[PDB]
Amino acid sequence: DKDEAWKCVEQLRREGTQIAYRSDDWRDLKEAWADILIVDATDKDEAWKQVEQLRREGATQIAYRSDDWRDLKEAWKKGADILIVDATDKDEAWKQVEQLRREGATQIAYRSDDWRDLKEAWKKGADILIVDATDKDEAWKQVEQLRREGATQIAYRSDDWRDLKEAWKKGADILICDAT
């Protein structure tokens, strides 16, 4: 389970940029404090409690993920620096980015499996573009496209360290170890 996730951080550290761990427990995120800690959306009462708990602990790059910008704005208020708009509906996603940008959100991230949706999010204000690899093999191609477009903070989400390493080589600067 989380032990597979852990073996890969091991390999990514060994291989040398920024590592992020997605996690539901806040201790695990701490034990892992991994440079970017992604508090996972599950009982917003507990999530906001982990952002808060991490902020007090001095954790420096706190991220929160949601499909709802209102939840992201709340997380931001409570100490999250990085606000991950989770796109599965394409157009309603770009709205979350747009709304957050209006609210003055500093580090908006956008999760998608399609580099063109990522490119568009980028234009609308997403500074962190997360390429979601679950058809793992191919997904570096998206990193490459975004690199070419001039995106400067490309993230790659994968449960496999070899794939993370390849993404990194194709220009991903944030490697998200996501083994649920």
Number of domains present in the structure of the chain: 1
Residue with tokens 């573009």: 129
Nearest to 113 by CA among 129, 95, 94: 129
This structure's resolution (Å) is 2.0
Residue 101: which domain range? 1-180
Nearest to 45 by CA among 26, 28, 58: 26
- Elucidation technique: X-ray
**Neighbouring residues of 154: CB distance < 8 A, sequence distance ≥ 6:** 129, 131, 143, 146, 147, 171, 172, 173, 174
Alpha helix positions (H), the chain: 2-14, 26-32, 44-57, 69-77, 90-102, 115-124, 140-149, 161-170
The SS3 assignment for 178 reads: coil
